[model samples]
Target: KYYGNGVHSTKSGSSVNWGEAFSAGVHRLANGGNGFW
Candidate 1:
């Protein structure tokens, strides 16, 4: 059970097409929200 840090951990990984995949979520966080660190 990898209790990771949500999409940040997985989306930031080099394995998957992170930016193309979770860019929205990341952007949402960056745009100002409590979802990110």
Candidate 2:
């Protein structure tokens, strides 16, 4: 996850960790630009 990492959440209006970003990126690449926010 984002815990203990250099990743930081900004302009999200909610708690968004590195896990979400990493997962989203992988999903997008794997699913052809389709992923969850």
Candidate 3:
């Protein structure tokens, strides 16, 4: 889902650890990518 402008925080909540980097990248466009407006 989209929020404000950037993508959602994976699980759509604020209850995740701050020491991992998964469920992101690949076809997930961000910032000024072609998959987003």
Candidate 4:
């Protein structure tokens, strides 16, 4: 099964929060913005 996590907006339908999304972005960015990392 295809799975994922963290502040997902598509499946929740307006249930996610701004801070969560922002933090997720920050984490992804801090990791050099590369999924390969």
- Which candidate has the top score in TM-score? 4
What TM-score does candidate 4 get on C-alpha atoms?
0.35
Candidate 1: tens digits of C-alpha lDDT, residues 1-37: 1333344456456445444455556777787875457
Error of 3 at 1 (Å): 26
Residue-level lDDT of model 4, residues 1-37, one tens digit each, is 1233444565564435544555556777777766335
The candidate that wins on lDDT is: 2
- Ten contiguous residues minimizing lDDT sum, candidate 4: 1-10
Each candidate's TM vs. the true structure?
0.26, 0.32, 0.16, 0.35
Better of 1 and 2 by lDDT: 2
In candidate 1, where is summed lDDT lowest over 10 consecutive residues?
1-10
How much does each candidate deviate from the true structure in C-alpha RMSD?
A: 7.5, 5.6, 9.0, 7.1
Can you tell me which runs of candidate 4 are displaced by over 4 Å?
A: 1-16, 33-37
Looking at candidate 3, the ten consecutive residues that score lowest on lDDT are: 14-23
Clashing pairs in 4: none
- Which ranking of candidates, highest lDDT first? 2, 1, 4, 3
Give me the displacement of residue 12 in model 4, in angstroms.
11
TM-score (C-alpha, index-matched) for candidate 1: 0.26
Q: What TM value does model 3 have?
A: 0.16
